[PDB]
Amino acid sequence: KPILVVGGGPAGLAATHALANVGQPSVLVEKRDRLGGAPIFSGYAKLVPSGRWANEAIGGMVSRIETDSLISIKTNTTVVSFDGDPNNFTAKLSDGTSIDCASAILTTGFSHFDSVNKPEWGFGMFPDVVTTTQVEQMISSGKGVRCLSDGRKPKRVAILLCVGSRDRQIGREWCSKICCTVSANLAMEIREELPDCHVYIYYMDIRTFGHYESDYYWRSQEEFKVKYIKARIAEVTSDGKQLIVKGEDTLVKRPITIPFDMVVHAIGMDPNVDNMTISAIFGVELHKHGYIARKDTYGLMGATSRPGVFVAGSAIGPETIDDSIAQANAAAMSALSLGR
Amino acid sequence: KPILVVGGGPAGLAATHALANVGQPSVLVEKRDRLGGAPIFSGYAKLVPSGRWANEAIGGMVSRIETDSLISIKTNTTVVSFDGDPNNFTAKLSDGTSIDCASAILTTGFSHFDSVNKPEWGFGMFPDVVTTTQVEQMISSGKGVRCLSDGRKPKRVAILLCVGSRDRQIGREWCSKICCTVSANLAMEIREELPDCHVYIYYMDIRTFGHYESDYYWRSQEEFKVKYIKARIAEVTSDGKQLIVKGEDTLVKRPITIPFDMVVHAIGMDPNVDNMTISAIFGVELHKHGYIARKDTYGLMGATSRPGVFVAGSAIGPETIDDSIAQANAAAMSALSLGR
Ligand SMILES: Cc1cc2nc3c(=O)[nH]c(=O)nc-3n(C[C@H](O)[C@H](O)[C@H](O)COP(=O)(O)OP(=O)(O)OC[C@H]3O[C@@H](n4cnc5c(N)ncnc54)[C@H](O)[C@@H]3O)c2cc1C
Ligand SMILES: Cc1cc2nc3c(=O)[nH]c(=O)nc-3n(C[C@H](O)[C@H](O)[C@H](O)COP(=O)(O)OP(=O)(O)OC[C@H]3O[C@@H](n4cnc5c(N)ncnc54)[C@H](O)[C@@H]3O)c2cc1C
Ligand code: SF4
Ligand code: SF4
């Protein structure tokens, strides 16, 4: 009897591999054409905290399951119906396949915030307003960091933190957790490629928690001369030659009008746009902010509101790769407990 | 053979229970007289993010293993020698017992920072300078938040963040990760008990990441009127009857001299004082800052530098309870893979 794992990103790749390593078969259902989740589909460059290229690090997590006979992979597929009870579930797939499964682990991840939803910060208005995902792709493709307007190397880059996060006005109250460290990492990578480029990070708080404090926040300043300015950004405009970052220096109303060649948005981790459908299909409760709800960890690790259905990773909220992998292995550990 | 789990806090309690739930026996070695780790021996009150009392939440994690015949608990015991290879280890315990084990999981945790090590901030000088652990104990005992000097209810409380963290001068470069949220939680608990008490939190950054942003940072301000001031604290002194917090108000570079009844230190999570001994005994590498090193998560989740030895939780660095529990379940999952 296999365990159904839904979503083939870092979390689903970790859960299926962990189960295969104890001789438990699984079926991995992935909606996209390829596995790897956001780090692969979105072309991430070097990951935090390892410094390894996502194509290699997550690519290896994909490779090792693609030829493991205990894992049946279904790409370009979704679960259209799910019924039954623990050790007696039936999952029907979009291609007509029916799977008799013991349990299900939801590793369906998140959705990148679309910066068109924060219009005052200029995304979609000006080509040189880019997301962190675009910068990751410029680096990971080896093309390099360049302005989209004319292909030039930027001499001044601003990174705006909290784009689509910590923003009650657009219904996104959460902190997306990893964007501070990702921005510090990207700022160092920009500086390594472009030694004449000045990088400024405009923030509300810097949240390089744990080991990220010295490895990313300190290092970005001392080795790479990245500048950090506490400011509430009002808008991004254009004077026809440069982009202009307008805001209030500190937490008060001290006006700032600073010119830049490129403005990067540290976009947040929205709940997966498919969560209302996943909730209806699997019969699992959602968190008040739209993520898939998880019970407290002291009881059954990774449990959803439904017996026999588990959840791990960014499906539950903004989350890092290391934590998503730990959660996925733990949810696999909980699903195995149903066999007694 | 059984799996050896060292340290009976949240992580060790989670690993042993998860193994027993799949029929794998374990031996839990705990140096102290009781299980529960820091939340129990340090008398934590309500936990984040659950809001449940640690005595109930972690107490249940202890209870459920104390009568599970698949788990052999050895309190007041340490591992004095460890030798062998995966599926062929021998652990010798301080009580003379010898354990033939398949693998070992290190869940040996951390050590609370002692603020006698930041003397300019008044700990040990004045009875009303307390740690967050002391405030947790005032609440969890049901005695309530009271000044040690005369037993009065404080009317003004200051919480100083980053005590023993983010401080290169004392060799503690890391961010201790959970103290921002713990302080916001404690500030709300103080306000709930003492409606006439004003609580001020002095910070460098507020790091209520993920779901903690709206549940703790925003709620502490909007529902509980907790005040947050960005400031670098130079010293804590006394005028004879009250404490004086002296610093520099970051936002508008101007000095501050503010009176308080109680000053709380948000103490950091140092590496376990036993880590050099554990490293020597188990033959595992340490992180540059003294924690137990963990390999990257993309390979084998929870692996140390030594084959067959795993690590989870605050042993690796400052860590939350939910993350420590997930990591412990994941390390149990990796230890099970050694059976092939
Ligand atoms: C710019 C940027 C850089 C980042 N870099 C880092 C970094 O360096 N380090 C770090 O720790 N974190 C990083 N993160 C965070 C990282 O993206 C997440 O931790 C990680 O992708 C979460 O993995 P996951 O498996 O939970 O979800 P995802 O990566 O979102 O994978 C979910 C998978 O499920 C699939 N899926 C979705 N819906 C369905 C459905 N209905 N049916 C079936 N399949 C479905 C998706 O197609 C996808 O393949 C970064 C984030 C951003 C925005
Ligand atoms: C004031 C305060 C409040 C906190 N509140 C929260 C909260 O609300 N929510 C949250 O998520 N986090 C909280 N934390 C963090 C929390 O304490 C940790 O996440 C948690 O204790 C880590 O669990 P652990 O099992 O890794 O380690 P520990 O709790 O440190 O347990 C380690 C165990 O191993 C034992 N041990 C140590 N050395 C040896 C050895 N040589 N041999 C054998 N046994 C050994 C110890 O005696 C102990 O029982 C708080 C921290 C502080 C300082
Ligand atoms: S991690 Fe940093 S950039 Fe991301 S939402 Fe939180 S405070 Fe903003
Ligand atoms: S979590 Fe907050 S209080 Fe703790 S070290 Fe980090 S910034 Fe300081």
PDB file of C-alpha atoms in Angstrom, chain A residues 11-255:
ATOM      1  CA  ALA A  11       9.416  18.766   0.681  1.00  0.00           C
ATOM      2  CA  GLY A  12       7.806  16.101  -1.613  1.00  0.00           C
ATOM      3  CA  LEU A  13      11.229  15.025  -2.887  1.00  0.00           C
ATOM      4  CA  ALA A  14      12.423  14.587   0.717  1.00  0.00           C
ATOM      5  CA  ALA A  15       9.286  12.674   1.871  1.00  0.00           C
ATOM      6  CA  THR A  16       9.279  10.206  -1.040  1.00  0.00           C
ATOM      7  CA  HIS A  17      13.031   9.519  -0.769  1.00  0.00           C
ATOM      8  CA  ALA A  18      12.802   9.025   3.026  1.00  0.00           C
ATOM      9  CA  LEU A  19       9.937   6.530   2.590  1.00  0.00           C
ATOM     10  CA  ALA A  20      11.759   4.620  -0.185  1.00  0.00           C
ATOM     11  CA  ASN A  21      14.829   4.412   2.152  1.00  0.00           C
ATOM     12  CA  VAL A  22      12.730   2.355   4.625  1.00  0.00           C
ATOM     13  CA  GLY A  23      11.126   0.216   1.869  1.00  0.00           C
ATOM     14  CA  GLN A  24       7.780   2.037   1.805  1.00  0.00           C
ATOM     15  CA  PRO A  25       6.470   2.750  -1.721  1.00  0.00           C
ATOM     16  CA  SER A  26       4.981   6.116  -2.602  1.00  0.00           C
ATOM     17  CA  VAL A  27       3.221   7.860  -5.483  1.00  0.00           C
ATOM     18  CA  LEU A  28       4.370  11.438  -6.153  1.00  0.00           C
ATOM     19  CA  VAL A  29       1.817  13.673  -7.910  1.00  0.00           C
ATOM     20  CA  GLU A  30       3.222  16.871  -9.412  1.00  0.00           C
ATOM     21  CA  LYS A  31       1.032  19.389 -11.312  1.00  0.00           C
ATOM     22  CA  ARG A  32       3.923  20.840 -13.384  1.00  0.00           C
ATOM     23  CA  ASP A  33       5.914  19.130 -16.165  1.00  0.00           C
ATOM     24  CA  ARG A  34       9.016  18.761 -13.968  1.00  0.00           C
ATOM     25  CA  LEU A  35       9.946  18.114 -10.351  1.00  0.00           C
ATOM     26  CA  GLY A  36      12.033  20.419  -8.137  1.00  0.00           C
ATOM     27  CA  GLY A  37       9.517  22.963  -6.937  1.00  0.00           C
ATOM     28  CA  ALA A  38      10.263  26.662  -6.752  1.00  0.00           C
ATOM     29  CA  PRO A  39      14.086  26.349  -6.600  1.00  0.00           C
ATOM     30  CA  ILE A  40      14.112  24.624  -9.988  1.00  0.00           C
ATOM     31  CA  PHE A  41      11.076  26.135 -11.761  1.00  0.00           C
ATOM     32  CA  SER A  42      12.063  29.633 -10.599  1.00  0.00           C
ATOM     33  CA  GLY A  43      15.780  29.164 -11.369  1.00  0.00           C
ATOM     34  CA  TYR A  44      17.279  29.883  -7.969  1.00  0.00           C
ATOM     35  CA  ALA A  45      21.043  30.501  -7.929  1.00  0.00           C
ATOM     36  CA  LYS A  46      23.071  29.725  -4.704  1.00  0.00           C
ATOM     37  CA  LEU A  47      20.950  28.622  -1.777  1.00  0.00           C
ATOM     38  CA  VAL A  48      21.094  29.687   1.790  1.00  0.00           C
ATOM     39  CA  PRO A  49      22.595  28.418   4.060  1.00  0.00           C
ATOM     40  CA  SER A  50      24.735  25.954   2.046  1.00  0.00           C
ATOM     41  CA  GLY A  51      25.986  28.260  -0.718  1.00  0.00           C
ATOM     42  CA  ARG A  52      25.298  25.441  -3.157  1.00  0.00           C
ATOM     43  CA  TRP A  53      23.700  26.016  -6.520  1.00  0.00           C
ATOM     44  CA  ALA A  54      20.015  25.063  -6.432  1.00  0.00           C
ATOM     45  CA  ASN A  55      20.338  23.245  -9.786  1.00  0.00           C
ATOM     46  CA  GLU A  56      22.901  20.931  -8.167  1.00  0.00           C
ATOM     47  CA  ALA A  57      21.462  20.700  -4.625  1.00  0.00           C
ATOM     48  CA  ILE A  58      17.773  20.302  -5.527  1.00  0.00           C
ATOM     49  CA  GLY A  59      18.656  18.670  -8.838  1.00  0.00           C
ATOM     50  CA  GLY A  60      20.232  15.804  -6.883  1.00  0.00           C
ATOM     51  CA  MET A  61      17.065  15.458  -4.760  1.00  0.00           C
ATOM     52  CA  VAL A  62      15.130  15.084  -8.060  1.00  0.00           C
ATOM     53  CA  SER A  63      17.655  12.716  -9.705  1.00  0.00           C
ATOM     54  CA  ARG A  64      17.794  10.265  -6.814  1.00  0.00           C
ATOM     55  CA  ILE A  65      14.049   9.626  -6.887  1.00  0.00           C
ATOM     56  CA  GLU A  66      13.578   9.544 -10.695  1.00  0.00           C
ATOM     57  CA  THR A  67      15.075   6.052 -10.979  1.00  0.00           C
ATOM     58  CA  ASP A  68      13.969   4.701  -7.535  1.00  0.00           C
ATOM     59  CA  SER A  69      11.483   1.869  -8.274  1.00  0.00           C
ATOM     60  CA  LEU A  70       9.729   2.401  -4.936  1.00  0.00           C
ATOM     61  CA  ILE A  71       8.555   5.866  -6.090  1.00  0.00           C
ATOM     62  CA  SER A  72       5.981   6.230  -8.878  1.00  0.00           C
ATOM     63  CA  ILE A  73       6.201   9.723 -10.309  1.00  0.00           C
ATOM     64  CA  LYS A  74       3.195  11.399 -11.992  1.00  0.00           C
ATOM     65  CA  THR A  75       4.080  14.775 -13.525  1.00  0.00           C
ATOM     66  CA  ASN A  76       1.460  16.989 -15.323  1.00  0.00           C
ATOM     67  CA  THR A  77      -1.062  15.452 -12.904  1.00  0.00           C
ATOM     68  CA  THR A  78      -3.268  16.550  -9.985  1.00  0.00           C
ATOM     69  CA  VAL A  79      -5.451  14.710  -7.465  1.00  0.00           C
ATOM     70  CA  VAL A  80      -9.066  15.326  -8.509  1.00  0.00           C
ATOM     71  CA  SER A  81     -10.768  13.280  -5.730  1.00  0.00           C
ATOM     72  CA  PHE A  82      -9.714  11.776  -2.411  1.00  0.00           C
ATOM     73  CA  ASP A  83     -11.901   9.570  -0.216  1.00  0.00           C
ATOM     74  CA  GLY A  84     -11.712   7.028   2.577  1.00  0.00           C
ATOM     75  CA  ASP A  85     -10.014   6.638   5.956  1.00  0.00           C
ATOM     76  CA  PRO A  86      -6.485   5.888   7.264  1.00  0.00           C
ATOM     77  CA  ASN A  87      -5.089   2.709   5.564  1.00  0.00           C
ATOM     78  CA  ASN A  88      -8.074   2.814   3.192  1.00  0.00           C
ATOM     79  CA  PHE A  89      -7.894   5.868   0.947  1.00  0.00           C
ATOM     80  CA  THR A  90      -8.607   6.088  -2.776  1.00  0.00           C
ATOM     81  CA  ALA A  91      -7.110   8.975  -4.744  1.00  0.00           C
ATOM     82  CA  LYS A  92      -8.335   9.623  -8.286  1.00  0.00           C
ATOM     83  CA  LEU A  93      -5.892  11.463 -10.579  1.00  0.00           C
ATOM     84  CA  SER A  94      -6.489  13.918 -13.465  1.00  0.00           C
ATOM     85  CA  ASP A  95      -5.215  11.296 -15.971  1.00  0.00           C
ATOM     86  CA  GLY A  96      -7.808   8.719 -14.790  1.00  0.00           C
ATOM     87  CA  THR A  97      -5.399   6.711 -12.545  1.00  0.00           C
ATOM     88  CA  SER A  98      -6.862   5.424  -9.270  1.00  0.00           C
ATOM     89  CA  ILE A  99      -4.473   4.947  -6.300  1.00  0.00           C
ATOM     90  CA  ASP A 100      -5.369   2.869  -3.222  1.00  0.00           C
ATOM     91  CA  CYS A 101      -3.176   4.563  -0.590  1.00  0.00           C
ATOM     92  CA  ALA A 102      -2.546   4.305   3.157  1.00  0.00           C
ATOM     93  CA  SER A 103      -2.212   8.051   3.798  1.00  0.00           C
ATOM     94  CA  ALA A 104      -1.424  11.302   1.998  1.00  0.00           C
ATOM     95  CA  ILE A 105       1.261  13.922   2.607  1.00  0.00           C
ATOM     96  CA  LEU A 106       0.535  17.380   1.226  1.00  0.00           C
ATOM     97  CA  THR A 107       3.765  19.063   0.093  1.00  0.00           C
ATOM     98  CA  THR A 108       1.995  21.451  -2.324  1.00  0.00           C
ATOM     99  CA  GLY A 109       4.036  24.505  -1.377  1.00  0.00           C
ATOM    100  CA  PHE A 110       3.348  28.180  -1.923  1.00  0.00           C
ATOM    101  CA  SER A 111       2.781  30.842  -4.606  1.00  0.00           C
ATOM    102  CA  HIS A 112       5.219  33.638  -5.298  1.00  0.00           C
ATOM    103  CA  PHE A 113       3.749  37.040  -4.492  1.00  0.00           C
ATOM    104  CA  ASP A 114       2.934  38.951  -7.726  1.00  0.00           C
ATOM    105  CA  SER A 115       4.329  42.485  -7.305  1.00  0.00           C
ATOM    106  CA  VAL A 116       1.629  43.873  -9.623  1.00  0.00           C
ATOM    107  CA  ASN A 117      -0.353  43.716  -6.259  1.00  0.00           C
ATOM    108  CA  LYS A 118       1.903  46.435  -4.730  1.00  0.00           C
ATOM    109  CA  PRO A 119       1.566  48.912  -7.649  1.00  0.00           C
ATOM    110  CA  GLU A 120       3.119  51.875  -5.900  1.00  0.00           C
ATOM    111  CA  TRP A 121       6.490  50.059  -5.802  1.00  0.00           C
ATOM    112  CA  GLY A 122       6.624  50.042  -9.656  1.00  0.00           C
ATOM    113  CA  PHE A 123       6.485  46.444 -10.855  1.00  0.00           C
ATOM    114  CA  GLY A 124       5.026  46.200 -14.362  1.00  0.00           C
ATOM    115  CA  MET A 125       5.354  50.011 -14.798  1.00  0.00           C
ATOM    116  CA  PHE A 126       9.145  50.038 -15.378  1.00  0.00           C
ATOM    117  CA  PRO A 127      11.236  47.195 -16.885  1.00  0.00           C
ATOM    118  CA  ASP A 128      14.110  47.782 -14.416  1.00  0.00           C
ATOM    119  CA  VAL A 129      11.839  46.984 -11.459  1.00  0.00           C
ATOM    120  CA  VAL A 130      12.577  43.288 -11.002  1.00  0.00           C
ATOM    121  CA  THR A 131      11.755  40.576  -8.468  1.00  0.00           C
ATOM    122  CA  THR A 132      14.286  38.565  -6.439  1.00  0.00           C
ATOM    123  CA  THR A 133      13.202  35.562  -8.637  1.00  0.00           C
ATOM    124  CA  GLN A 134      14.293  37.512 -11.769  1.00  0.00           C
ATOM    125  CA  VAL A 135      17.715  38.262 -10.162  1.00  0.00           C
ATOM    126  CA  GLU A 136      18.100  34.569  -9.121  1.00  0.00           C
ATOM    127  CA  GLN A 137      17.449  33.653 -12.803  1.00  0.00           C
ATOM    128  CA  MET A 138      19.900  36.280 -14.148  1.00  0.00           C
ATOM    129  CA  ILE A 139      22.620  34.681 -11.980  1.00  0.00           C
ATOM    130  CA  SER A 140      21.637  30.971 -12.327  1.00  0.00           C
ATOM    131  CA  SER A 141      21.406  31.222 -16.160  1.00  0.00           C
ATOM    132  CA  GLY A 142      24.917  32.756 -16.213  1.00  0.00           C
ATOM    133  CA  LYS A 143      23.540  35.728 -18.236  1.00  0.00           C
ATOM    134  CA  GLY A 144      24.379  38.084 -15.370  1.00  0.00           C
ATOM    135  CA  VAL A 145      22.588  40.949 -13.648  1.00  0.00           C
ATOM    136  CA  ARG A 146      21.530  43.472 -16.333  1.00  0.00           C
ATOM    137  CA  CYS A 147      18.858  46.186 -16.724  1.00  0.00           C
ATOM    138  CA  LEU A 148      15.958  45.031 -18.930  1.00  0.00           C
ATOM    139  CA  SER A 149      15.527  48.569 -20.357  1.00  0.00           C
ATOM    140  CA  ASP A 150      18.845  48.581 -22.300  1.00  0.00           C
ATOM    141  CA  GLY A 151      20.857  45.562 -21.118  1.00  0.00           C
ATOM    142  CA  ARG A 152      23.409  47.671 -19.192  1.00  0.00           C
ATOM    143  CA  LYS A 153      25.127  46.517 -15.989  1.00  0.00           C
ATOM    144  CA  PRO A 154      23.476  48.506 -13.139  1.00  0.00           C
ATOM    145  CA  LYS A 155      25.774  50.809 -11.158  1.00  0.00           C
ATOM    146  CA  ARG A 156      23.170  51.352  -8.353  1.00  0.00           C
ATOM    147  CA  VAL A 157      20.719  48.648  -7.152  1.00  0.00           C
ATOM    148  CA  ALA A 158      18.082  49.022  -4.450  1.00  0.00           C
ATOM    149  CA  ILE A 159      16.476  45.959  -2.862  1.00  0.00           C
ATOM    150  CA  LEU A 160      13.096  46.664  -1.208  1.00  0.00           C
ATOM    151  CA  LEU A 161      12.260  44.215   1.544  1.00  0.00           C
ATOM    152  CA  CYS A 162       8.791  43.007   2.546  1.00  0.00           C
ATOM    153  CA  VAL A 163       7.189  43.153  -0.904  1.00  0.00           C
ATOM    154  CA  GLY A 164       3.870  41.399  -0.415  1.00  0.00           C
ATOM    155  CA  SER A 165       4.531  40.685   3.280  1.00  0.00           C
ATOM    156  CA  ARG A 166       3.963  42.548   6.588  1.00  0.00           C
ATOM    157  CA  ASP A 167       1.307  44.570   4.721  1.00  0.00           C
ATOM    158  CA  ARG A 168      -2.175  44.633   6.362  1.00  0.00           C
ATOM    159  CA  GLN A 169      -3.532  46.901   3.553  1.00  0.00           C
ATOM    160  CA  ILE A 170      -3.152  44.113   0.948  1.00  0.00           C
ATOM    161  CA  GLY A 171      -4.238  41.302   3.354  1.00  0.00           C
ATOM    162  CA  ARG A 172      -0.709  39.905   3.785  1.00  0.00           C
ATOM    163  CA  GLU A 173       0.011  40.184   7.509  1.00  0.00           C
ATOM    164  CA  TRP A 174       2.651  37.473   7.735  1.00  0.00           C
ATOM    165  CA  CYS A 175       6.412  37.792   7.526  1.00  0.00           C
ATOM    166  CA  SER A 176       7.719  35.647   4.637  1.00  0.00           C
ATOM    167  CA  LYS A 177      10.688  34.579   6.843  1.00  0.00           C
ATOM    168  CA  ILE A 178      13.484  33.903   4.374  1.00  0.00           C
ATOM    169  CA  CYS A 179      13.462  37.032   2.168  1.00  0.00           C
ATOM    170  CA  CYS A 180      15.837  39.042   4.436  1.00  0.00           C
ATOM    171  CA  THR A 181      18.508  36.328   4.179  1.00  0.00           C
ATOM    172  CA  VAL A 182      17.784  35.675   0.489  1.00  0.00           C
ATOM    173  CA  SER A 183      18.167  39.426  -0.203  1.00  0.00           C
ATOM    174  CA  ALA A 184      21.494  39.574   1.688  1.00  0.00           C
ATOM    175  CA  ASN A 185      22.644  36.535  -0.343  1.00  0.00           C
ATOM    176  CA  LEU A 186      21.521  38.050  -3.658  1.00  0.00           C
ATOM    177  CA  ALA A 187      23.173  41.384  -2.752  1.00  0.00           C
ATOM    178  CA  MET A 188      26.514  39.515  -2.208  1.00  0.00           C
ATOM    179  CA  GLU A 189      26.088  37.654  -5.514  1.00  0.00           C
ATOM    180  CA  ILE A 190      25.351  40.934  -7.370  1.00  0.00           C
ATOM    181  CA  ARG A 191      28.464  42.506  -5.750  1.00  0.00           C
ATOM    182  CA  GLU A 192      30.638  39.506  -6.694  1.00  0.00           C
ATOM    183  CA  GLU A 193      29.603  39.779 -10.370  1.00  0.00           C
ATOM    184  CA  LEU A 194      29.558  43.615 -10.487  1.00  0.00           C
ATOM    185  CA  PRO A 195      32.362  45.080  -8.282  1.00  0.00           C
ATOM    186  CA  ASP A 196      31.455  48.653  -9.348  1.00  0.00           C
ATOM    187  CA  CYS A 197      27.744  48.214  -8.438  1.00  0.00           C
ATOM    188  CA  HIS A 198      26.480  49.810  -5.167  1.00  0.00           C
ATOM    189  CA  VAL A 199      23.726  47.744  -3.489  1.00  0.00           C
ATOM    190  CA  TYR A 200      21.306  49.260  -0.919  1.00  0.00           C
ATOM    191  CA  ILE A 201      18.709  47.301   1.046  1.00  0.00           C
ATOM    192  CA  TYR A 202      15.694  49.252   2.364  1.00  0.00           C
ATOM    193  CA  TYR A 203      14.136  47.551   5.358  1.00  0.00           C
ATOM    194  CA  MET A 204      11.669  47.615   8.241  1.00  0.00           C
ATOM    195  CA  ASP A 205      13.583  44.935  10.218  1.00  0.00           C
ATOM    196  CA  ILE A 206      16.491  42.707   9.250  1.00  0.00           C
ATOM    197  CA  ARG A 207      15.510  39.119  10.137  1.00  0.00           C
ATOM    198  CA  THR A 208      18.698  37.056   9.509  1.00  0.00           C
ATOM    199  CA  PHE A 209      17.913  34.761  12.447  1.00  0.00           C
ATOM    200  CA  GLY A 210      20.072  31.961  13.879  1.00  0.00           C
ATOM    201  CA  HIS A 211      23.296  31.279  11.961  1.00  0.00           C
ATOM    202  CA  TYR A 212      22.241  33.670   9.196  1.00  0.00           C
ATOM    203  CA  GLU A 213      23.262  36.689  11.291  1.00  0.00           C
ATOM    204  CA  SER A 214      26.983  36.385  10.840  1.00  0.00           C
ATOM    205  CA  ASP A 215      26.973  34.350   7.592  1.00  0.00           C
ATOM    206  CA  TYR A 216      24.701  36.753   5.695  1.00  0.00           C
ATOM    207  CA  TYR A 217      23.947  39.996   7.488  1.00  0.00           C
ATOM    208  CA  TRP A 218      27.482  40.655   8.791  1.00  0.00           C
ATOM    209  CA  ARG A 219      29.290  39.182   5.804  1.00  0.00           C
ATOM    210  CA  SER A 220      27.195  41.185   3.290  1.00  0.00           C
ATOM    211  CA  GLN A 221      28.335  44.391   4.986  1.00  0.00           C
ATOM    212  CA  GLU A 222      31.961  43.597   5.863  1.00  0.00           C
ATOM    213  CA  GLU A 223      33.045  41.533   2.830  1.00  0.00           C
ATOM    214  CA  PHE A 224      30.653  42.922   0.187  1.00  0.00           C
ATOM    215  CA  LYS A 225      29.928  46.530   1.374  1.00  0.00           C
ATOM    216  CA  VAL A 226      26.167  46.118   1.067  1.00  0.00           C
ATOM    217  CA  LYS A 227      24.363  49.127   2.640  1.00  0.00           C
ATOM    218  CA  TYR A 228      21.267  48.759   4.834  1.00  0.00           C
ATOM    219  CA  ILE A 229      18.852  51.669   5.393  1.00  0.00           C
ATOM    220  CA  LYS A 230      15.816  51.453   7.692  1.00  0.00           C
ATOM    221  CA  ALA A 231      13.023  53.136   5.718  1.00  0.00           C
ATOM    222  CA  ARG A 232       9.294  52.992   4.984  1.00  0.00           C
ATOM    223  CA  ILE A 233       9.201  53.102   1.165  1.00  0.00           C
ATOM    224  CA  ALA A 234       6.295  55.083  -0.265  1.00  0.00           C
ATOM    225  CA  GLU A 235       6.853  54.487  -3.992  1.00  0.00           C
ATOM    226  CA  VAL A 236       9.155  53.863  -6.922  1.00  0.00           C
ATOM    227  CA  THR A 237       8.943  56.290  -9.821  1.00  0.00           C
ATOM    228  CA  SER A 238      10.987  57.207 -12.913  1.00  0.00           C
ATOM    229  CA  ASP A 239      12.544  60.525 -13.951  1.00  0.00           C
ATOM    230  CA  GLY A 240      13.016  59.089 -17.456  1.00  0.00           C
ATOM    231  CA  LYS A 241      16.707  58.153 -16.887  1.00  0.00           C
ATOM    232  CA  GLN A 242      16.763  56.438 -13.454  1.00  0.00           C
ATOM    233  CA  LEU A 243      14.308  54.838 -11.059  1.00  0.00           C
ATOM    234  CA  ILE A 244      13.608  56.874  -7.912  1.00  0.00           C
ATOM    235  CA  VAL A 245      13.010  55.231  -4.522  1.00  0.00           C
ATOM    236  CA  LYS A 246      10.876  57.599  -2.364  1.00  0.00           C
ATOM    237  CA  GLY A 247      10.368  57.082   1.323  1.00  0.00           C
ATOM    238  CA  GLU A 248      10.692  58.064   4.947  1.00  0.00           C
ATOM    239  CA  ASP A 249      14.107  57.475   6.645  1.00  0.00           C
ATOM    240  CA  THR A 250      13.738  55.355   9.910  1.00  0.00           C
ATOM    241  CA  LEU A 251      10.099  54.918  11.247  1.00  0.00           C
ATOM    242  CA  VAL A 252       9.129  58.677  11.168  1.00  0.00           C
ATOM    243  CA  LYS A 253       8.603  60.964   8.059  1.00  0.00           C
ATOM    244  CA  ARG A 254      12.173  62.098   7.072  1.00  0.00           C
ATOM    245  CA  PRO A 255      11.937  62.398   3.215  1.00  0.00           C
TER     246      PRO A 255
END
